[PDB]
């Protein structure tokens, strides 16, 4: 039973209600493979491509941790999603926007070269789930002082191979280092590369692999 409605206990009803209003009925392969285990709290290494429905795969358990632990603007940041490009960062964010329609928790797109000071003032408020792009996020983490990440629960790395290709290998190593180690970490990459396997060691602990 790969339907979405059988994910009620495991995932908040307000999440399923939104997803039902998105027009989805049944889970894709990676969703079925990934969600159940990710809810339990395992670190995933996924060999996924765009079109697999991987976005929802990582978003459902991400929003779940934020709702479960009842995060507030007070609590700083909870989930951190990394995207190579602005196109994908925005893409993922639009989905997040749809999924958060029946939630009160704070979410924002702290990505791309676009008005740095307005983002800083925004993050100061307390943004629970953040869809971001690496190079700019590190800039906030090193320079924006009122940015709280100490409470981080989930870290998602979308299109890992594509992140390295745009030249963010060092930007990655430096965000991960500065992140609290007690966390769930998810790694999605279409192409299994030598470099990809290396930052997987840095990011993950003992992953359930999914192809
Ligand atoms: Mg660079
Ligand atoms: Mg991928």
Residue numbers in the entry: 171 to 179, 185 to 386
What's written in the study?
DExD/H-box RNA helicases, from virus and bacteria to eukaryotes, play important roles in processes including ribosome biogenesis, RNA processing and folding, ribonucleoprotein (RNP) remodeling, RNA nuclear export, the regulation of RNA translation and transcription, and nonsense-mediated RNA decay. DExD/H-box proteins often contain accessory regulatory domains and localization modules, but their cores consist of two RecA-like domains joined by a short flexible linker. The N-terminal domain is commonly referred to as conserved domain-1, or DEAD-domain, and the C-terminal domain as conserved domain-2, or helicase domain. Both domains contribute to the binding site for RNA substrates and both contribute to ATP hydrolysis. We used X-ray crystallography to determine the structures of the DEAD-domains of DDX2A, DDX2B, DDX5, DDX10, DDX18, DDX20, DDX47, DDX52, and DDX53, as well as the helicase domains of DDX25 and DDX41.
DDX18 (Myc-regulated DEAD-box protein, or MrDP;) is a nucleolar protein that is specifically upregulated in highly proliferating cells. Motifs Ia, Ib and II seem unaffected by the state of ATP hydrolysis, and their conformations remain unchanged even in the crystal structures in which the nucleotide binding site is not occupied. In all single DEAD-domain structures, α-helix 8 has adopted a position that would block the RNA binding site.
